[PDB]
Amino acid sequence: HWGYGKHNGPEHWHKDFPIAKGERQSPVDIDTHTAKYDPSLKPLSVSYDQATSLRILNNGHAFNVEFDDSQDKAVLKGGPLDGTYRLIQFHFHWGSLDGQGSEHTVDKKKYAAELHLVHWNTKYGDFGKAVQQPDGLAVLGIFLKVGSAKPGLQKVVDVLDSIKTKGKSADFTNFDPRGLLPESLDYWTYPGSLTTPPLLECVTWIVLKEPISVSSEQVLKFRKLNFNGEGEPEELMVDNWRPAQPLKNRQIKASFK
Numbered sequence: 408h409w410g411y412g413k414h415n416g417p418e419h420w421h422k423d424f425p426i427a428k429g430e431r432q433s434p435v436d437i438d439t440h441t442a443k444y445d446p447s448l449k450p451l452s453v454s455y456d457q458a459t460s461l462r463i464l465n466n467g468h469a470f471n472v473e474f475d476d477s478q479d480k481a482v483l484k485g486g487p488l489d490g491t492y493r494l495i496q497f498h499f500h501w502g503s504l505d506g507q508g509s510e511h512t513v514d515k516k517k518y519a520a521e522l523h524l525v526h527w528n529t530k531y532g533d534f535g536k537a538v539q540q541p542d543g544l545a546v547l548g549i550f551l552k553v554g555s556a557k558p559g560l561q562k563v564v565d566v567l568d569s570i571k572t573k574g575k576s577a578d579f580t581n582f583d584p585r586g587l588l589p590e591s592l593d594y595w596t597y598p599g600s601l602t603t604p605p606l607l608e609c610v611t612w613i614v615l616k617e618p619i620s621v622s623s624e625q626v627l628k629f630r631k632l633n634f635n636g637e638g639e640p641e642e643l644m645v646d647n648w649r650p651a652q653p654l655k656n657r658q659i660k661a662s663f664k
């Protein structure tokens with residue numbers, strides 16, 4: 408099945424997911440000089456005060472911190488978006504080395520990791536129905552650079568030992584995802600896709616300009632996770648990112664000058 412190795416990695420995915428070679432694939436490189444300022448963009452509204460985290464799951468490819476999405480409790484709106492998008496999970500993609508790991512790049516620059524906060528458009532009733540729509544998802548993307556520790560990430564880092572292998576999960580209530588955000592909400596935006604199979608072209612990408620800093624030791628702990636299940640030979644969960652895909656017939660807009 409699909410993964411990030413030599414024989415099942417991003418160069419293979421197109422065989423089971425033909426949309427891998429489609430017209431609005433993610434991630435892309437963000438050419439800062441070509442991304443036009445759009446003064447019609449609104450400020451981003453991130454309303455996470457009432458977020459209810461539930462659980463953290465190692466799904467064999469990343470770990471997802473899941474949220475209660477049965478009511479409007481943590482929502483994204485405004486920016487490029489029409490209407491309301493509810494947070495359902497967040498995860499990360501990261502590298503084996505500090506100099507790679509992000510999916511989006513900025514003038515070809517790779518960050519050490521990238522956080523994806525996944526939201527679905529509440530006009531479509533649930534996540535499953537949202538992913539059958541071209542405007543079904545909004546994914547807020549945040550780069551991580553190695554530097555000082557991010558205090559608000561530490562609870563996530565401390566629980567990883569308990570979900571080392573594929574299929575393990577742990578209670579993860581009362582986590583405040585506001586602690587993962589940078590100061591500025593300046594962003595670039597463009598239409599794309601999930602960066603993992605099924606690679607569906609549902610996503611308004613909103614990619615923050617300001618990275619967050621995490622410590623060396625924080626990202627080190629991400630890299631001790633395993634892709635394999637318990638009882639199977641150890642394959643470290645690192646380099647679970649897809650490289651930049653062709654931009655094709657898309658313009659990236661900037662929210663800021």
Ligand SMILES: Cc1ccn(O)c(=S)c1
Pocket residue numbers: 523525546600601602603
């Ligand atoms: C919903 C979903 C699941 C996995 N990934 O990587 C992304 S970007 C979005």
Ligand SMILES: [Zn+2]
Pocket residue numbers: 498499500523602603
């Ligand atoms: Zn992702």
